[PDB]
Amino acid sequence: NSELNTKIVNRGKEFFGSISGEKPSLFNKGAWMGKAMDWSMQNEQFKIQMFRFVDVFPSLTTSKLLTEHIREYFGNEQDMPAFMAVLNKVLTSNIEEMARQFIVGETTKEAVKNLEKLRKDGFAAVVDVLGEATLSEEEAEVYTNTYLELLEALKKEQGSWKGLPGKGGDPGLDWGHAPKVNIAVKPTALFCLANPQDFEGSVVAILDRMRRIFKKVMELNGFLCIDMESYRHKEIILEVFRRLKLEYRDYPHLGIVLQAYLKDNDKDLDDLLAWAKEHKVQISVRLVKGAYWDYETVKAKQNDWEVPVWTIKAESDAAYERQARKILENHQICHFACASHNIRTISAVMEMARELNVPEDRYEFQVLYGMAEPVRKGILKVAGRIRLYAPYGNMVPGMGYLVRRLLENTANESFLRQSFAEDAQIERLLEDPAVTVERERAARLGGLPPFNNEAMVDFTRADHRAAFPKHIAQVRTQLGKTYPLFINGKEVRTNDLIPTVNPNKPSEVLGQICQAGTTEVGDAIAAAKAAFPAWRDTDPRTRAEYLLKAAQAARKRLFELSAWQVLEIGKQWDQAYADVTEAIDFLEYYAREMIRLGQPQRVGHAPGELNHYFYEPKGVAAVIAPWNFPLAISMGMASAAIVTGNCVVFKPSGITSIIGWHLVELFREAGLPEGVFNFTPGRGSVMGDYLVDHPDISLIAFTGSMETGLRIIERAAKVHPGQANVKKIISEMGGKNAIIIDDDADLDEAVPHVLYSAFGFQGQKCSACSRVIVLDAVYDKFIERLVSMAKATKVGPSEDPANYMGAVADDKAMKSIKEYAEIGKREGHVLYESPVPAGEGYFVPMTIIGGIKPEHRIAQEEIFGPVLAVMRAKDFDQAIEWANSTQFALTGGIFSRSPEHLAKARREFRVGNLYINRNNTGALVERQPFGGARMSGVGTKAGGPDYLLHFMDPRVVTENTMRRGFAPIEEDDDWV
């Protein structure tokens, strides 16, 4: 109502007048910090450098690291802004001061002292131990015992504390009603593998530590608040809160954060309230807007997910007022902490509490330490119940927090910045955000929508979590079939059968595969050759349409197709779903690529002449596919050849033949003309060379081992009698991929990314990291954390989402990988070797081996398993040299925050796909066109804009258009 609004605006106006002139420290341009923040708000390029420098700063531990990074981020001393070895001391001290702005101490004992001082100034606190996204069980224990230690200290002191002044009640309690000891805990700091993919396991592990903390909290009648973090963990955290609450249904001092910036929150808050009523318990909510807005937006768009946050700032403000109102309406069962620095927001809560006549012991106000000082003073004066969020700890564990503060204070849409950095437009600042919302909503090829990668599986969703076990079960009702060849549109059975089994459980037979002899392979090639002329003459637009149809067919079977892979080749849930989406991506991308390349282009501009340049297919393509990306790679190579006008004879890998059969199913459903796609699984020793040597073959697409690929290249180079063309070769032959960890690397990112690159899908990826090359100065520290996280992971059946990795492809892979592991143990020193499950299954321990140098076999030879080599580089030059020391050059990674070292790696770390500050696997179509040279391939990049040309050859038609001195004028003619 406009009546409540008026009272709110008028209260905001009084809040501002009582604050007149007083600015927050961060906006005081008479101190270094205010000058630095000011220039960051005025110069975006400078903000980016300063903020990144702050992040890397605590890792700059030598005089060399500091001096060089300063110059790389701020340029020469004669070139920096005026407010910016002496240079080292000046910057260090200023940056250190900026860090302690937001912390009440580095240590527990320091924190307690400073906390006891804040009470004397009249301030309550909620204490947080700085830390998040823990990397190991041992780290989670340190975090847990720190709270235990903190609570012991506070227990011994709270008895001596006078309760903060109030309107009455218990003088031993704060304001007469609030427990004097109040702490906040970050759930992800309690379990290093927190992941909604393993929902139940994440909840339990976190719950068990939270319960241990909660028990100590309750002993001193304290308050525990459970912080909310990134959207990825919101449902996990809600469930932790509910279970703990029900375990102690009568204990009222337990709170949960709810983030008004989430679209989910209107429902989440309704649900929680209804839940509390249903169970006859009381709850407490700290309502916040949200701390991870940029991250959530970015992460959502990188995965083609719904962005979980509102995208207009005033919508979070409007949501907050809505939800606060709802909470206050429900004050009988829901205690309320208002957590905002926004004077409009605060004034709104205050008026709503008055309008709903809410008792004062049912709501309090909270702000972050070091921030919005006058706002905080205003709250203290006018309401009297102010609690400071007071975090403590060191700069590296606190970095995420600290950077979030600088973001928060300097964002364009920051209420604080708009109030205290720009000429404050008080009326605009205090307007009902709903009105603001409505006004800003007011302001805001070939018929095909442009390409977008298919949405990734999203385990924050209940239905996605439930989908896998259901579809795995459904696949199990359909095992035991005999799969035939598919030639010229017909099923062809043979006598030679090879069973395909579950690698995590070999006694489970999934089906039997007919093998084609050379007679059937010959038939398929002949079928292909016969279908060719009509296919080649089919319009590129029509050909692309079949791919589009096949993509819709696949999209509709996404979870079913994934489940088959989970069982047949031992893909983890995410790995399986990613394999199918990539297949879909290839279909959609190559469709568009053929449509683009399908139209003849006029070349040259001379008059009286028309030159058209255009492409044509080659003929019969042999597609020889690997087992490790059984749908994605197969479909990529086959659809590529098919859309470009060729016809395909396709040999799937034996152990993934059912996945190969999925191509048959999809192209069938798309109505593909007979003979255009043929499925001929067979024994390579029987029909391998035959397929490659055949004179009717014009193109060979292959992915697999270097040995095989190089043999194919050599044999295909011969022109046999009758062979119309020199055989085109598309080969991808794997790698020995390294990630370099520079001495300034962010280890909290580096460690889990390295672990995933190495052991995701048991390391069975051409792209997998099999070498981590670590700079001398961070070696011991990085290695300890890597091994520590590794020890937390579990090896077991891929159908169980609690397992990090599982059995390798087949027994041959197991025997060969184990031999490599033994060689590695003699060359270096084992750092970690995981347990494996007892009994059947092709299990190889997750294995990390140190002491490795370029001369070693496991530093050179592709193992294609869960064996990671760790190599100690003396400096960054050697790290680069070592990275380039194999005969492969497929992928590579580097964790570094030195612009110079990154610039050097971009130039000199010459792999087909180099990744900076993330894992070196998970290449997406269009975004990361995939493939390398040297012994890794012939420089063809799947999923990119040069790929389709490899399956075709260009032709030019030149026409003399002049007849008897008369030529037609064309639009783009050079004329006069």
Q: Cβ neighbours of residue 320 under 8 Å, at least 6 residues apart?
A: 260, 287, 289, 340, 345
Choice among 588, 766, 799, 862 that is catalytic: 766
- Residue 737, annotated ligand binder? no
Q: Which does 220 bind (CB under 5 to 8 A by kind): a second copy, ligand FAD, none?
A: none
The conformational region for residue 667 under phi > 0 = left, psi -120 to 50 = alpha, else beta, is alpha
Q: Which does 341 bind (CB under 5 to 8 A by kind): a second copy, ligand FAD, none?
A: ligand FAD
Binding site for ligand FAD (CB under 6 A): 227-228, 257, 259, 261, 288-293, 309-313, 315-316, 339-342, 345, 366-368, 389, 408, 413-416
Considering only residues 482 to 511 of the shown chain, the ones binding a second copy according to CB under 8 A are none
Task: Tell me which of 90, 298, 424, 497 binds a second copy, using CB under 8 A.
Answer: 298
- Residue 186, annotated ligand binder? yes
Task: Tell me which of 618, 694, 771, 794 binds a second copy, using CB under 8 A.
Answer: 618
- Residue 313, annotated ligand binder? yes
830-854 burial, b at 16+ Cβ within 10 Å, e below that, comes to ebbbbebeeeebbbbbbbbbbebeb
Stretch that binds a second copy, among 570-578, 687-695, 864-872, 959-967 (CB under 8 A): 959-967
Cβ atoms 687, 496 nearer than 8 A: no
Q: Where are the alpha helices (DSSP H) in 603-656?
A: 632-643
Q: How far is the CB of 246 from ligand FAD (least distance, A)?
A: 22
CA distance 450 to 445: 7
Extract the tokens encoding 696.
């009717």
Beta bridge partners of 502: 505
DSSP assigned state of 516: P
Contact pattern from residue 842 through residue 881 relative to a second copy, giving x for each residue in contact according to CB under 8 A and a dash for the rest: ----------------------------------------
Q: How far is the CB of 341 from ligand FAD (least distance, A)?
A: 4
Cβ atoms 259, 289 nearer than 8 A: yes
Task: Tell me which of 718, 812, 815, 874 binds a second copy, using CB under 8 A.
Answer: 718
Residue 647 designated active-site? no
Q: Cβ neighbours of residue 204 under 8 Å, at least 6 residues apart?
A: none
- Residue 277, annotated ligand binder? no
Is 394 one of the binding residues for a second copy (CB under 8 A)?
Answer: no
CA distance 500 to 661: 12
Q: Cβ neighbours of residue 522 under 8 Å, at least 6 residues apart?
A: 690, 694
Q: How far is the CB of 317 from ligand FAD (least distance, A)?
A: 6
Contact pattern from residue 39 through residue 58 relative to a second copy, giving x for each residue in contact according to CB under 8 A and a dash for the rest: -----x---x--xx--x---
Considering only residues 273 to 292 of the shown chain, the ones binding a second copy according to CB under 8 A are 292
Q: How far is the CB of 313 from ligand FAD (least distance, A)?
A: 4
Q: Which does 414 bind (CB under 5 to 8 A by kind): a second copy, ligand FAD, none?
A: ligand FAD
Stretch that binds a second copy, among 317-325, 330-338, 469-477, 924-932 (CB under 8 A): 924-932
Considering only residues 398 to 437 of the shown chain, the ones binding a second copy according to CB under 8 A are 399-400, 402-404, 406-407
Is 882 one of the binding residues for a second copy (CB under 8 A)?
Answer: no
Residue nearer to ligand FAD on the CB measure, 270 or 413:
413
Stretch that binds a second copy, among 121-129, 435-443, 475-483, 961-969 (CB under 8 A): 961-969
CA 890 to chain centre: 21
Q: How far is the CB of 696 from a second copy (least distance, A)?
A: 13
CA distance 761 to 500: 19
Read off φ and ψ for residue 224, nearest 5 degrees. -110, 125
CA distance 527 to 529: 6
After what residue numbers is the chain broken, C–N > 2.5 angstroms? Answer: 84, 444
- CA distances for 17 relative to 11, 243, 343, 382, angstroms: 10, 46, 12, 13
Residue nearer to ligand FAD on the CB measure, 338 or 666:
338
Cβ atoms 664, 513 nearer than 8 A: no
Residue found by looking up tokens 């699984």 in the block: 681
Choice among 431, 560, 732, 862 that is catalytic: 732
Q: How far is the CB of 792 from ligand FAD (least distance, A)?
A: 24
Q: Which does 233 bind (CB under 5 to 8 A by kind): a second copy, ligand FAD, none?
A: none
- Residue 259, annotated ligand binder? yes
Q: Which does 590 bind (CB under 5 to 8 A by kind): ligand FAD, a second copy, none?
A: none
- Residue 311, annotated ligand binder? yes
Q: Which does 719 bind (CB under 5 to 8 A by kind): a second copy, ligand FAD, none?
A: a second copy
Q: How far is the CB of 947 from a second copy (least distance, A)?
A: 10
CA angle at 402 for the pair 397 and 403, rounded to the nearest 5°? 110
CA distance 136 to 788: 5
Q: Quick check: helix, strand or coil at residue 828? A: coil
Is 949 one of the binding residues for a second copy (CB under 8 A)?
Answer: yes
Give the number of other Cβ atoms within 10 Å of residue 117's Cβ. 11
- Residue 303, annotated ligand binder? no
Considering only residues 894 to 923 of the shown chain, the ones binding a second copy according to CB under 8 A are 897, 902, 906-907, 910-918, 923
Q: Cβ neighbours of residue 349 under 8 Å, at least 6 residues apart?
A: 321, 324, 328, 338, 340, 363, 365
Considering only residues 731 to 770 of the shown chain, the ones binding a second copy according to CB under 8 A are 731, 746
Residue found by looking up tokens 């050059």 in the block: 889
Q: How far is the CB of 602 from ligand FAD (least distance, A)?
A: 24
CA distance 878 to 895: 15
Residue 732 designated active-site? yes
Is 396 one of the binding residues for a second copy (CB under 8 A)?
Answer: no
Give the number of other Cβ atoms within 10 Å of residue 725's Cβ. 15
Write the single-letter amino acid at 195: N
- Residue 286, annotated ligand binder? yes
Q: Cβ neighbours of residue 696 under 8 Å, at least 6 residues apart?
A: 525, 526, 528, 529, 619, 620, 722, 723, 724
Q: Which does 717 bind (CB under 5 to 8 A by kind): a second copy, ligand FAD, none?
A: a second copy
Q: Which does 367 bind (CB under 5 to 8 A by kind): ligand FAD, a second copy, none?
A: ligand FAD
CA distance 498 to 513: 5
Contact pattern from residue 507 through residue 546 relative to a second copy, giving x for each residue in contact according to CB under 8 A and a dash for the rest: ------------------------------x---------
Binding residue ranges for (S)-lactate: 186, 404-405
Binding residue ranges for FAD: 228, 259, 286, 289-291, 293, 311, 313, 340-342, 408, 415
Residues carrying an active site annotation: 732, 766
Binding residue ranges: 186, 228, 259, 286, 289-291, 293, 311, 313, 340-342, 404-405, 408, 415
